Amino acid sequence: TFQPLNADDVRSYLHKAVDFISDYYKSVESMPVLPNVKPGYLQDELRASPPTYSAPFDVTMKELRSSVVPGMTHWASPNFFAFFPSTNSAAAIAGDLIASAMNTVGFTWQASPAATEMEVLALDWLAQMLNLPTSFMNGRGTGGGVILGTTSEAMLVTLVAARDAALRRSGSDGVAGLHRLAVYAADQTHSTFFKACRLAGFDPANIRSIPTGAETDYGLDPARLLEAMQADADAGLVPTYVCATVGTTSSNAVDPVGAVADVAARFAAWVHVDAAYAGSACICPEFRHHLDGVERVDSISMSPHKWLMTCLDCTCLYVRDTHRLTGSLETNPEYLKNHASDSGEVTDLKDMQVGVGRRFRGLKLWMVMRTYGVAKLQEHIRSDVAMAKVFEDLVRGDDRFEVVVPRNFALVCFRIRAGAGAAAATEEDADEANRELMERLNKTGKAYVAHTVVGGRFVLRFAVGSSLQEEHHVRSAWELIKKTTTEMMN
Amino acid sequence: TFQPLNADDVRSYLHKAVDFISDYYKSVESMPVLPNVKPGYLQDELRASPPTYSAPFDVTMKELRSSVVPGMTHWASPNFFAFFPSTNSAAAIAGDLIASAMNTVGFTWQASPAATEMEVLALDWLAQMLNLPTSFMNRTGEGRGTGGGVILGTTSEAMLVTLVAARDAALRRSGSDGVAGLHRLAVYAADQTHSTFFKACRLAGFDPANIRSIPTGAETDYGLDPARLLEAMQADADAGLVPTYVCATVGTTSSNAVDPVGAVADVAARFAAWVHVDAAYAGSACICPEFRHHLDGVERVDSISMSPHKWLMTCLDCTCLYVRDTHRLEVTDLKDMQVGVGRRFRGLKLWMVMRTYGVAKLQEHIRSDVAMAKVFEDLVRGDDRFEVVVPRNFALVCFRIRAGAGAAAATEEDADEANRELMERLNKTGKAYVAHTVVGGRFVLRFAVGSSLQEEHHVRSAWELIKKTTTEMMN
Numbered sequence: 019t020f021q022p023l024n025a026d027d028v029r030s031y032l033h034k035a036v037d038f039i040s041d042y043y044k045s046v047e048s049m050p051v052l053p054n055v056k057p058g059y060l061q062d063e064l065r066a067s068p069p070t071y072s073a074p075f076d077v078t079m080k081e082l083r084s085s086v087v088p089g090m091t092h093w094a095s096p097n098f099f100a101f102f103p104s105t106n107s108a109a110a111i112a113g114d115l116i117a118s119a120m121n122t123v124g125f126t127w128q129a130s131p132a133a134t135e136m137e138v139l140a141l142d143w144l145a146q147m148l149n150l151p152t153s154f155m156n157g158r159g160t161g162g163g164v165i166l167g168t169t170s171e172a173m174l175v176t177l178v179a180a181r182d183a184a185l186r187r188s189g190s191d192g193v194a195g196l197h198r199l200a201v202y203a204a205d206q207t208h209s210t211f212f213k214a215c216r217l218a219g220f221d222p223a224n225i226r227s228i229p230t231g232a233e234t235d236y237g238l239d240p241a242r243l244l245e246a247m248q249a250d251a252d253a254g255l256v257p258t259y260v261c262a263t264v265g266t267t268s269s270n271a272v273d274p275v276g277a278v279a280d281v282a283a284r285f286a287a288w289v290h291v292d293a294a295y296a297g298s299a300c301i302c303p304e305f306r307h308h309l310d311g312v313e314r315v316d317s318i319s320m321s322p323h324k325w326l327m328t329c330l331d332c333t334c335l336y337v338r339d340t341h342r343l344t345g346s347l348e349t350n351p352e353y354l355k356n357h358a359s360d361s362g363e364v365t366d367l368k369d370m371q372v373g374v375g376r377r378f379r380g381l382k383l384w385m386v387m388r389t390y391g392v393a394k395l396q397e398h399i400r401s402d403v404a405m406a407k408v409f410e411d412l413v414r415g416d417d418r419f420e421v422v423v424p425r426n427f428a429l430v431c432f433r434i435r436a437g438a439g440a441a442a443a444t445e446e447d448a449d450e451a452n453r454e455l456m457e458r459l460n461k462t463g464k465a466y467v468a469h470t471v472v473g474g475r476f477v478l479r480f481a482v483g484s485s486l487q488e489e490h491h492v493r494s495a496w497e498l499i500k501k502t503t504t505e506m507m508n
Numbered sequence: 509t510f511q512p513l514n515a516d517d518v519r520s521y522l523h524k525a526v527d528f529i530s531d532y533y534k535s536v537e538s539m540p541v542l543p544n545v546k547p548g549y550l551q552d553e554l555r556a557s558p559p560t561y562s563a564p565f566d567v568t569m570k571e572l573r574s575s576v577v578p579g580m581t582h583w584a585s586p587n588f589f590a591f592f593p594s595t596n597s598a599a600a601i602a603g604d605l606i607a608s609a610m611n612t613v614g615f616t617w618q619a620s621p622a623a624t625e626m627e628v629l630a631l632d633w634l635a636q637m638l639n640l641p642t643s644f645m646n647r648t649g650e651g652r653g654t655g656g657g658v659i660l661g662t663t664s665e666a667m668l669v670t671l672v673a674a675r676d677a678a679l680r681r682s683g684s685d686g687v688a689g690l691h692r693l694a695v696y697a698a699d700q701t702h703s704t705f706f707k708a709c710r711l712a713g714f715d716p717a718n719i720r721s722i723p724t725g726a727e728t729d730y731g732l733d734p735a736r737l738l739e740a741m742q743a744d745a746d747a748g749l750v751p752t753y754v755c756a757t758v759g760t761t762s763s764n765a766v767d768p769v770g771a772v773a774d775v776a777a778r779f780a781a782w783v784h785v786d787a788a789y790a791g792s793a794c795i796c797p798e799f800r801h802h803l804d805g806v807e808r809v810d811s812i813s814m815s816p817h818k819w820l821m822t823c824l825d826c827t828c829l830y831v832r833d834t835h836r837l838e839v840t841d842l843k844d845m846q847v848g849v850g851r852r853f854r855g856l857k858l859w860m861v862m863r864t865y866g867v868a869k870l871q872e873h874i875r876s877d878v879a880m881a882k883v884f885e886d887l888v889r890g891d892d893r894f895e896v897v898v899p900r901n902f903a904l905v906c907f908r909i910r911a912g913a914g915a916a917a918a919t920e921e922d923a924d925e926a927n928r929e930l931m932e933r934l935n936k937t938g939k940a941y942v943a944h945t946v947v948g949g950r951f952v953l954r955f956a957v958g959s960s961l962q963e964e965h966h967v968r969s970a971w972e973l974i975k976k977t978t979t980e981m982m983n
């Protein structure tokens with residue numbers, strides 16, 4: 019008699035959720051971006067124990083509005099300027115809602131053919147937008163792709179494939195040889211790469227974080243990479259894997275992809291390109307040069323759930339040889355066996371990821387591309403970049419401020435210059451002035467700004483592109499920075 | 509001038525999705541559970557390249573109805589009897605829809621306080637339903653517990669991150685220079701533990717030579733024999749290897765065997781090995797007192813996982829990992845014990861399920877699935893041509909046509925072929941989806957009760973179809 023998917027409840031709960039969402043988008047800008055709660059508030063307000071009895075879903079939604087929403091940081095706010103925006107769209111939310119309701123589990127093709135074939139089709143469409151070489155999709159090709167939750171999983175599975183190949187060819191006695199494998203990335207590489215290395219069992223003493231400096235705009239210098247890898251090879255270590263980043267998290271530095279692949283090829287090392295954020299911009303011809311050389315790397319990942327209007331989670335991994343991944347990741351449990359899998363004519367996507375089950379993530383990505391089309395997706399990239407250029411040129415027109423690195427995409431790095439005011443004579447002073455500025459913009463509730471460290475300096479990041487954000491939001495943000503800065507001097 | 513979240517599109521697209529969903533549940537039983545498509549069907553229906561121009565969302569929805577839905581396997585069907593059902597609820601779907609619209613990333617408490625606290629809260633609520641010791645809890649009623657939890661994507665992820673924590677702890681215990689001593693670490697699980705666990709062991713860098721799959725037999729109903737485990741671990745310790753981690757499963761995938769948790773924890777304690785309980789499916793049943801005995805001894809293990817996205821009415825992804833006494837590793841989940849950093853607000857839908865329906869309805873949800881499974885099991889036991897292969901512990905029944913049922917099921921090899929034929933004929937009708945396993949070297953049909961729209965009459969009707977089909981086979 020209890021039917022959790024009864025027709026009446028399905029329609030009314032979801033209608034109430036849609037009403038909440040409409041109200042939320044109309045009212046989010048008026049809320050403070052950052053909340054004013056203390057750790058532990060939530061269990062105080064909800065209770066410590068689940069209710070014994072049921073409640074009308076209107077009560078659940080009231081507690082959502084009363085206790086959850088006021089304790090949120092509003093990533094959807096047009097005044098959220100931190101990290102990178104989680105850009106979103108009605109088509110993507112619609113697609114994920116439909117996937118959640120059908121709730122298929124696509125470990126094998128047979129487990130739901132449409133879920134796997136649409137994932138393959140969405141990956142292929144995106145590869146076409148990105149102008150990936152045909153070696154990255156799939157009649158003799160060996161390339162292909164998989165949608166994963168995170169860049170970390172994409173790093174982990176390619177690290178495992180590279181690890182297993184290095185151990186096999188170098189003659190390791192089982193994993194006795196694992197302590198001789200070495201891996202390489204610039205010191206601007208996201209911290210999650212180094213964690214994935216540790217997960218896969220690489221020795222922390224052999225995880226090389228290569229220094230970068232202002233001379234290359236903090237991109238990886240391939241001469242410094244070659245020297246590190248050669249020194250390891252001369253010491254009896256096995257260079258195994260290099261991560262190059264296009265669009266680093268701190269300052270949007272860009273590693274030279276082709277030059278890195280050429281260096282790594284001297285050692286037969288795996289090369290993965292992390293383009294989690296800036297990959298989406300490469301659907302535009304004027305940005306596609308940042309991926310030159312990708313035809314010589316082993317794998318590349320990017321996240322539509324950053325800059326391609328697809329809600330979390332959605333990270334796309336492309337490899338030139340899927341057999342290298344399935345060799346490490348495949349299983350063949352009896353209860354999943356089926357004629358299609360046996361035939362070799364399908365790829366079961368459990369064999370391209372860590373886990374077994376998986377959501378129908380292909381649906382929302384296809385719905386975004388199918389509904390909006392390439393031209394609109396390109397104009398979405400370009401309008402975000404143009405807003406960022408407005409903000410950069412505003413920073414450059416005020417001699418109290420400096421733009422710390424060149425702007426490649428929609429992120430501007432800036433700070434209060436030294437010698438800008440009495441409260442910033444030295445550069446250690448200017449450091450504390452910028453920290454004060456940031457904490458003052460955040461208490462306002464009309465901004466969320468977070469910082470980074472660029473060449474030993476305290477720097478404010480301004481990451482443009484929250485989906486609700488328009489040009490006037492960025493200009494008003496500039497006025498608020500200017501205004502707050504003046505009040506700090508006197 | 510293009511606004512992807514403009515008010516008109518948000519309402520109209522979502523209302524069209526809700527209409528599709530309402531229609532889907534009302535009509536999914538009339539569709540064949542398994543589709544009649546061949547590999548590659550989709551690229552013959554839809555365009556090969558992404559469109560340059562935009563299209564009305566109605567066109568997108570028409571292609572979903574015309575080309576996607578006909579190629580799906582309907583997990584939501586009441587006649588879906590395979591694997592474990594992905595049980596679901598209006599509250600869970602609503603919660604995941606709201607999470608997608610807010611679209612926050614909770615990689616720190618500050619990156620969204622409500623999101624981190626709600627995940628912690630949802631985990632602490634479920635821990636109470638499971639009657640876990642406070643050593644697995646973050647907050648208690650008036651203070652703090654000594655443990656913690658995190659909401660992960662898969663049971664495989666839970667195994668991987670606990671394997672990594674145990675691996676690193678054993679390397680320090682054994683004075684390894686970095687990973688130099690990794691080749692000495694051994695790991696253990698029954699041969700009925702999911703193959704994804706042995707894959708996770710290889711992912712974490714354990715040596716294939718040291719990954720132990722312990723044989724099980726019918727004498728323990730394919731549960732792990734702790735004496736066999738002790739023998740294997742003692743042998744490795746005597747050879748200079750370091751016993752590092754044991755996985756005990758409550759409700760194995762193939763036949764729902766149950767490993768003896770407390771006995772496994774005691775054997776493993778003699779070597780200081782990490783013990784993880786995998787209760788991906790059966791964990792949800794342990795919110796009922798008549799099932800909670802299966803978790804006796806959990807106070808002595810190191811970690812336990814279960815997946816609400818199997819049997820607790822929460823759509824994928826939702827796997828809960830609990831770790832005891834996390835100091836050995838203000839209000840935060842164990843964010844370092846996941847593969848990635850930035851992922852969805854998974855806790856909202858889990859809280860909405862518990863807050864909207866309550867503990868009593870969740871328990872009756874478990875009990876009424878088990879009662880349907882018992883009905884099916886008694887129907888099978890009442891027909892001499894069939895046998896129930898192992899005792900039914902939860903809502904999965906394993907059965908087969910036995911040898912001697914007919915002239916076409918004379919030898920045990922013939923019964924194997926007849927069971928495969930029965931399965932394929934059932935699936936061809938579109939009125940069922942059944943899949944198989946192998947138990948004690950015999951081909952066995954699984955019957956997994958619990959798809960959310962499924963009622964008792966669906967189960968009785970499936971049994972009549974099984975009888976009808978078997979009769980037509982034996983001529």
Ligand SMILES: *Cc1c(COP(=O)(O)O)cnc(C)c1O
Pocket residue numbers: 102167168169170171208210263265266267292293294295324333847848849850851
């Ligand atoms: C966003 C970001 C990541 C995030 O990694 P996850 O594992 O998905 O959380 C990694 N690399 C770059 C360059 C990023 O911008």
Ligand SMILES: *Cc1c(COP(=O)(O)O)cnc(C)c1O
Pocket residue numbers: 372373374375376592661662663664665702704757759760761786787788789815827
């Ligand atoms: C579900 C199942 C698994 C597989 O889990 P994933 O979440 O798909 O990785 C592992 N163990 C058991 C007992 C299962 O039922």
Ligand SMILES: [Ca+2]
Pocket residue numbers: 359362
């Ligand atoms: Ca195969």
Ligand SMILES: [Ca+2]
Pocket residue numbers: 398401402483484485487
């Ligand atoms: Ca924009």
Ligand SMILES: [Ca+2]
Pocket residue numbers: 649650
């Ligand atoms: Ca209190």
Ligand SMILES: [Ca+2]
Pocket residue numbers: 873876877958959960962
């Ligand atoms: Ca039920």
